[PDB]
Scaffold this active site. Structure first.
Site, PDB file in Angstrom:
ATOM      1  N   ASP A  35       0.834  -1.198   0.000  1.00 53.79           N
ATOM      2  CA  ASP A  35       0.000   0.000   0.000  1.00 53.79           C
ATOM      3  C   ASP A  35       0.870   1.249   0.000  1.00 53.79           C
ATOM      4  O   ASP A  35       1.333   1.671   1.059  1.00 53.79           O
ATOM      5  CB  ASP A  35      -0.912  -0.025   1.228  1.00 53.79           C
ATOM      6  CG  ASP A  35      -1.822   1.173   1.307  1.00 53.79           C
ATOM      7  OD1 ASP A  35      -1.925   1.903   0.301  1.00 53.79           O
ATOM      8  OD2 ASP A  35      -2.450   1.374   2.372  1.00 53.79           O
ATOM      9  N   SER A 199      -0.500  15.476 -12.138  1.00 52.23           N
ATOM     10  CA  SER A 199      -0.717  15.110 -13.526  1.00 52.23           C
ATOM     11  C   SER A 199      -0.955  16.366 -14.362  1.00 52.23           C
ATOM     12  O   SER A 199      -1.480  17.371 -13.879  1.00 52.23           O
ATOM     13  CB  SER A 199      -1.923  14.174 -13.622  1.00 52.23           C
ATOM     14  OG  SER A 199      -2.292  13.916 -14.965  1.00 52.23           O
TER      15      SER A 199
END
Ligand SMILES: Cc1nc(N)sc1-c1nccn1C
Length: 330
Positions: A35, A199
């Site tokens: 994770d 992004s």
């Protein structure tokens, strides 16, 4: 040193991925959910409330000659989905794919919430976010990667998740045969303890690319792709019959649909998520309403590049002095 381990979807939908981990002496092998959105290595154990164990493999520290109670240490964590676990702490030897750390904090669960009990395939979590998020008190503990880093050939790990197929976590090296083209690296903020990056935009299907900054986290422990409501609406508007369902908890779409791809930007590079990766199947058994793999982050407080996005790429988690993230197509 290096390590290399195969990671396998837990079910036919890729709801999560499990990776075998050796703990203790002699080894006890547990299948952990790696994770990159949390920083605790915790396991089902001989200390877990018996009624809360239903098919998981447990760690029994009393059977490990290298286990030592970390006296006074406790931990307690809760995840974005509302699940949780808590307990006490041992140190022990932990190996992943041939890479060994001695003295790793292994957080033994005394309690786990119902969604952990109900998932017989996940024996615990191995956190790979920054150690500043580790929950152990009163002495915070380091992640497996943080403990291993100085020994690695290069201070990196990589995630290469498969779509409905096994994939690989590598530690200490970049497998240049595992991706196409080049790796595009992008800046990371560690201020919130995550692999947080920006992004450069998105496209839906064959549509034109929209240049827009989208801050979010690279999170292998989250199944889906959670993005701003504007972006998610633009995606689902291209699917006949798709709608946001308050009763189901997100966007659903007709199971008869052919979903379009979704592209996200990494600098000037582009990662394409095929439409197939966005299908999470019937909302309930036998339904013709299917659950979408791109969902709104509104009310989460952060955008999450979960497995739906990451499995479309070869992803480098670069733990150099200034951490960065790399993405390549594959
Ligand atoms: C819903 C969907 N959209 C695609 N582009 S392939 C696909 C699908 N239908 C059944 C299975 N899978 C993966």
């Amino acid at each position: 040193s290096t390590g290399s381990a195969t990671t396998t979807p837990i079910d036919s939908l890729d709801d999560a991925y499990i990776t075998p981990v050796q703990i203790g002496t002699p080894a006890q092998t547990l299948n952990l959910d790696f994770d990159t959105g949390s920083s605790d290595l915790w396991v089902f154990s001989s200390e877990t409330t018996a009624s809360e164990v239903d098919g998981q493999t447990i760690y029994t520290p009393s059977k490990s000659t290298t286990a030592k109670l970390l006296s006074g240490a406790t931990w307690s964590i809760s995840y974005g989905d509302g699940s949780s676990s808590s307990g006490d702490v041992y140190t022990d030897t932990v190996s992943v794919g041939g890479l060994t750390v001695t003295g790793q904090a292994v957080e033994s669960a005394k309690k786990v919430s119902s969604s952990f009990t109900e998932d017989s395939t996940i024996d615990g979590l191995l956190g790979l976010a920054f150690s500043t998020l580790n929950t152990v008190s009163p002495t915070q503990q380091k992640t497996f990667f943080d403990n291993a880093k100085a020994s690695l050939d290069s201070p990196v790990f990589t995630a290469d998740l498969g779509y409905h197929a096994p994939g690989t976590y590598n530690f200490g090296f970049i497998d240049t045969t595992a991706y196409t083209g080049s790796i595009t690296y992008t800046a990371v903020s560690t201020k919130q303890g995550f692999w947080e990056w920006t992004s450069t935009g998105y496209a839906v299907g064959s549509g034109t690319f929209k240049s827009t900054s989208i801050d979010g986290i690279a999170d292998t422990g989250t199944t889906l792709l959670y993005l701003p409501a504007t972006v998610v609406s633009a995606y689902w508007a291209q699917v006949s019959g798709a709608k946001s369902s308050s009763s189901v908890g997100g966007y659903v779409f007709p199971c008869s649909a052919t979903l379009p791809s979704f592209t996200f930007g990494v600098g000037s590079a582009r990662i394409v998520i095929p439409g197939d990766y966005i299908d999470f199947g019937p909302i309930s058994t036998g339904s013709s309403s299917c659950f979408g793999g791109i969902q709104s982050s509104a009310g989460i407080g952060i955008n999450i590049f979960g497995d739906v996005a990451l499995k479309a790429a070869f992803v480098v988690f670069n733990g150099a002095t200034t951490p960065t993230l790399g993405f390549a197509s594959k």
